[model samples]
Target: MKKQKVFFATTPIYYVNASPHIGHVYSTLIVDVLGRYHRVKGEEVFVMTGTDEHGQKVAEAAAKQGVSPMDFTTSVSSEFKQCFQEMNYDMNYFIRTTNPTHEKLVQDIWKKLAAKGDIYLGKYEGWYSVSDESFLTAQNVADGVDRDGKPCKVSLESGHVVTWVEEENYMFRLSAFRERLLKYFHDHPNCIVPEFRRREVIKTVEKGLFDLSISRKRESVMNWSIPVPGDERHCIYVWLDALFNYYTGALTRVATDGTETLDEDHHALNRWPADVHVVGKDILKFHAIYWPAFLMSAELPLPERLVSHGWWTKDHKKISKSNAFDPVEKAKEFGIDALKYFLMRESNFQDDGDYSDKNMVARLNGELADTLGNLVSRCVAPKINVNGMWPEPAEYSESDKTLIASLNNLAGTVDHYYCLPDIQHALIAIFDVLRSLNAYVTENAPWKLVKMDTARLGTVLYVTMEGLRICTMFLQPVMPQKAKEIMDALGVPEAARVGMENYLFGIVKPGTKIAGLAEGQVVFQKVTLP
Candidate 1:
């Protein structure tokens, strides 16, 4: 609970404009998957997610359902949590912008911005993307015609419709932060990840920043959001209120029921200057420019780094949800970890990936079955027992040295990818090691060795088991339950399972017959395409 092993990441607070979809789930999973990696290695990381409940959309949603906005938002927020539960996510907090603590804290930040003279009243008129809750310039708003053939403008990134908005609103001097942000880019080589994304941001910033319209008129919209401090005519824009939930969530206490309450000495909680901010390409501008400028205006910390992950594409098209599969039902049909493994293994984290079930079934039947599961069941089968003891290595064969070297080199290689949260790369590293492992097992002919050369066979089996022990250590974050099963099957003690550090710390010792190996335990169940 101290600052020693702290890392923080968050999903953008989702707008309650619609039910949470596959795209929303995709973003949240990315955050949690990365957090899970840090956690298994002993980092007390915070990965927060929540619903953005303040907007015209919320008001309409409540009216449509004949419920209070509070009730409606809570219902949708619960759906996200329930969906996460079905997917087996161990998240820290499910924050909502409507929480009283959130409102109070953001208002405090608002007062600070005003104190710094970064906010002012303005007569604003332009196009606004309600789905995104962002004001766009004439150019960023693209002209188009909908089904009715009426001329309309769409937000270029999200492709969501934009509406004309003429109102007296408060504006943040985002343009004022141009020079400061430019120096931030020049000074910090890591202001953004996937350097390509950084250059794109620079081009946008160079085109020049504009003062941002930060409030919506109460008369023109839901007016149910956090009211502008001391100004009743306007409500804080949904996007503005949305960004602070992450800050409020970190310091706020979450109850067992997943609702949040204020922490004691709230003013003493200086949890700003967040370390990691993750966003999809669609909303990257809001986080990179608008949110950071708000922090600067409040004289708070500019964020550390931004990860703009690529979007999902269906058959090479920019798509998320489809008839490809029922994410929830399929997960129940196969298993949670299998699906999780498929996501990390199949998709390149930096590129748009085509999610194909054909490939997914192959991964399940092939790698999880043909490779990893085969190794587990093959090593533990009763016909192949080593006097009910973990086989220890006798002498290092060239092939055995190949495995040991791979195992020894495993931590260093995966650590670099995990640090960048390049989950795909980290996963591939483990699989490559597993491939090397399976090849070694086949070549050594452990069954024949068990008969002809018992001592050498014992060494081979032990080395293989030890290699498995190390692989399980690396896989635990991505496939927690399966990795746990692997360890329990291998006779690793629960009491001795702590202190799992990076590449250096050793866990398994020779002859760890901690449990009796039984044959045919279905660790990774094979799944078929429906």
Candidate 2:
């Protein structure tokens, strides 16, 4: 079948210096949700996510874990892959910087930039933050303290301790891209999401940009990174290598024999120049600033948009390794889709969002079980729906037409926000549809029509059932498994689930047998606290 449009989305390839956290889960799941949304719009979609395994950060983590860098990256990258699988992230590819294919591509990119005269070998003296794996200007450093409270210099952004480094390495002319990046941003105002972030990038670049160190001393990082092309004594900077994962992932294709190769005709090649990159706000500088510069210098097409989502804090405190919340454990306890829905509904991507068990349970039970599930049970109650089939509607009442009209328009309404990748508002619109459905049910009194007028009762019941079908269709992105269960219970056929184009009122055939209504199933279980 021919696809109508192609859309590519990505998540920040996570740094494997530490295990996955709720923040990691949040970003990955959001991208998954967006990819699913686009697919529902009848678009071809590809989503990429994986691990950033090379850097001073990973080398330090490896030493602390008493393992070689390769072993350490393998272990942690596996954890990320497993967690995403458990959460049902429908990613097209999981790219790793350690992949030989990716390493070669990074070296190739470096050569292209060097050939373009964008890279120069020079002596570098600056404050470097090992924890952040970033080179900082003096203005970006601050007075801070070490673990023992002694005064020391630190990175102003991450508050990680900074150490002075003096060495010879290659540098990229980031300074030259100031006007070029500004022009790109001016021409494409929507390139960076949330006007505030775009303004921040503009202001910073307008102030000035310094040439960036693009390589590190091989001995300093223990040679744990990709070697600079033709210069084995230095290792490619972590950010440069890490940022290219999106490009390489879009180019990689797996053959039927399970071997990977690069081919322009490969399916992956069609996904280049990705649509959106979902990332945390902390890395905005790298993605919004440095990433575009590298792409421009390499003479490659830049990604269309960057969504710098907010962080998730636990108990109103910064979430750290020592105080991290385990997302995998939560998925195991509460249902995966349930946790996913809670995160999308509660977390505002533009700013900081807090997480707590209290909020999670309240939102899940309040919205999913109370609002949505109740509507499903009311419409499909076996006692009321005695025929075990969709009843034929007689004629439309003004109320019925009102509800159906809203249902018909729901997809267009949700699309406005989904295109912004603004999940919170899109959810609000969907749940409002639910609210209208529940109200229509309460007002029409389907039970009263069951005894007095069978045909009118069928009309009321049919409207409600059709409404449930459409609402759950939109819910598929957030709650894939549960949404499928509801759809199956409604007897929606596989062929008939043709996404947005099929979202219409009165689509289910009259007298179609309901599959699960007579058997008595709980579509969504309510969560209770003891």
Candidate 3:
């Protein structure tokens, strides 16, 4: 199968009603890793993440703050941008739904659907979730109690209270595409990942589909959203407006002067049909069902894959605002790379991963500090690496051949997991080889060979340093800065730091002398458990 040389990856445009939570950070981090992994494979990569700024939820929050909707979104969106920067996220573009180009693009999409007869006006009545911004059928609603102990109807999925809403609005012909969506999912088994999630969507579509309300009364939304094309009386539904950010972002082009314009050329348009969309399980229905339905109606290509992940929890409870686990503060406490490593290593690809101070401290000290850091520190120590030149190899021992073979196979192992998007397992595989390298060091006892057997000692030191070079390069997609520190210290040229070319074993010449391999620096410091 042929794959595009250009890889486009995205995180769901986060709603900017509040500061980012751990889940938001985790989602963006996942996409960042995917994009970086593709880039390391010698492909052209683009990553998109930003704020979803238009919605009634945002309008209400703005009112409470006594600020304009524009003002509120501006401040909150800046915070999201700042957070990603602080965490060193390498996103290619940060798109906001409120951008004029995006608003125009979304309204144009509505007109295109309406022109194709997939959109019609009708009166809609249902149990609506203000927080979720969704209209639920009676079957999907359940009786629940509010925070103040008042009985209420709530969404069975989100637990957010719902109110009966009846209004005249535009409806999308979501029912028309039910069988088509089923066919698409059937044909592309991996379109919606995690077999369980695909099953959930299949079951929902099998139950039958109803026309979806795609617009809201202007007054109901405080007139703060993109107005329906040629209809000032209503605003486009927030989800519809928000979902088009991916398309609009793909068509967007930046000029040398820093102004952005829409490019309709063949080359620019190739970015559409995103390679992957990293989202939360909570929004699976929107991205998997509704999003593709909309694309089918508009005759646009659907996304290649939707990789929905589970949420983050602390103490086995969901991390909510009331029970906050501030990712920013946590990143400051641990090094940024350590936090990134913990998130990728601790969480399974599609299941909830608990976050605790103890777990993070343990992973940092045990895997990072003791296993990985200790290996690097010892390999570059003044006693063994006194010459700072990669040593020439003599006759190889069986142990040497075995470790080299393992080094040769490391990239394919990591690559397989990355393609599966089984990120936790990918990290595990990397660490598995790291442990083997440690054992190889102990078994060889390079320290004793330094005085008596110079040739054997050089071969041992050279083999270990080559392993470190290969391992750290693989680690770049997850912990870029830490990976760079080791790669730089090894005097791997700037051009050798990325891509598949430098990923193999024995790339370093025997006589190559590294300039920066000093004795006293710590690569990763041990952390005191909190």
Candidate 4:
């Protein structure tokens, strides 16, 4: 299949009521890996992440902290931005729902939908969950007892208390899109990835949809959200506003009120219809269901794909600010690429994974130091690699053909798995090649070969250097800095930045000397395990 000219992927705008945990960091890391992989294919990619800083939840939190909503979001947003930068993500936009541009973009969406008669004012009388910033149906709420033995109705899903409250608010005609939404899922069977997630989304739409309340009254004021366009008495739904950040990020950075500037034109800004929207499993319903419906109401194209991932736990408990481990600090201890690789390698794609300092240390040492670093040090040492030159091969033996063929296969295999987005499987495939090269080197015994036949030793060392270059280039998406370090140290030129078509295809010439292959070189240092 031919690829699209534009590629866009986004992590959900993490709500900015507090500092983020590893789960948020982990989501960014996953999409970063995806975005980088697409870029390596020479595609134009826009990777987005941002803060959702509206709703009563954020308002109360800010008041509790003695800060205004804007101040609270600015402080937490900066912290989150620094966190991603520290972790080495190359995201294009760091959207804040509080942006003047975002407010306009969201309001424009409301205006469009309302003009289409898809948005209307209605009474919302239901059990309200202040903690969730959402309304729940009676069926979804259950009777519960509080710590003080007080009777309360709470959302079964969140365990947050709910109270009956009736307020007049604007609602989106989500029910109007129910049949259309079902038709879309049926038409694009693979739109929601993992197939199972698609099933879940389809099930929800089939169960029947209702018009969603898209605004809250002024006194309740949703804690500090964008006021509903043309209606100062209510605030637009926070999620509804937050969802448009993806469009706002790429389409324009300017507010209609002259606070910011718009992009050239829709014809030029037609990067719409994001290629993939990566969300946590907890949010599948919103992104897969509600988001598309909103887009439909506004007569815009739906995002092409929805990618949902499972969560992370520490010591078998859900991660929170109080009990979670800091992934950035973990990177400081272990190294950035180590955390990047572990976040992919240690967990199965689309499943929850646990974090153990012990698991990270062991996995890093085994792959980075034991397998990858050991191979590089073995091949690129001063004597064997001859100052990092791609050793010229005198001739090829059957064993040599076997070795180079296997090494050449890795790049494509990793590409396939990454496109499938089974990152854990991709790493396993790369390591399979690493293990092959390691064993091939052992079997050839280049140490023994050099003493016996200098011609054969040249053949062995050249293949090893070529093999190392192939592995390093393919590994770049997951470990950008480290891979470039190995490639640069080995003197692999930028022109040789070819993927899949490497190794025997000869991205670099023979006799190319490298920089860091000193007599006893180790690119990776061993970590002390707790």
Best by lDDT: 3
Candidate 1 pairs with clashing backbones: 391-462, 392-459, 393-459, 394-459, 491-515
Q: For every model in order, what is the number of clashing pairs?
A: 5, 0, 0, 3
- Backbone collision tally, model 1: 5
Give a tens-digit lDDT track for model 2, residues 1-530.
75433688999988887677787889999999999988877777889899988887788888988999999989989999888888888998888899999999999899989999999998888788889887788999999999999999989899999989988999999999999999989998889998789998999999989888889989888889999988889999988999999888788887878777665422535787888999888888989899999999988888889999887787688877685678777777777887888789987778788877888888778888888888888876876788878888888978789889999998888888888878888889999999899998888887787788888888888888888888888888889998888888888777556566667787889888877644556766677764
Candidate 1 TM-score, true structure as reference: 0.91
Q: lDDT score of model 2?
A: 0.85
TM-scores of all candidate predictions against the true structure: 0.91, 0.94, 0.94, 0.92
* Shift in Å, residue 322, candidate 4: 6.4
Clashing pairs in 4: 254-260, 254-261, 389-512
What's the TM for model 4?
A: 0.92
User: Compared with the true structure, what per-residue lDDT tens digits does model 1 show for residues 237-347?
Assistant: 777788877768667866688666766433334444556787887778888777877877766667777877766555555553443445676577667778778877887
Give the local distance difference test score of model 1.
Answer: 0.75
By descending TM-score, how would the candidates be arranged? 3, 2, 4, 1
Residues forming the 10-long window of minimal summed lDDT in candidate 3: 261-270
State the TM-score for model 2: 0.94
lDDT of 4 by residue, 211-289 (tens): 8888887668544878886778888877788888887877754455645555733446556777778888888898888
Query: Model 3 over residues 279-325: C-alpha lDDT tens digits?
Result: 99888898999999998887888888999898888978877677578
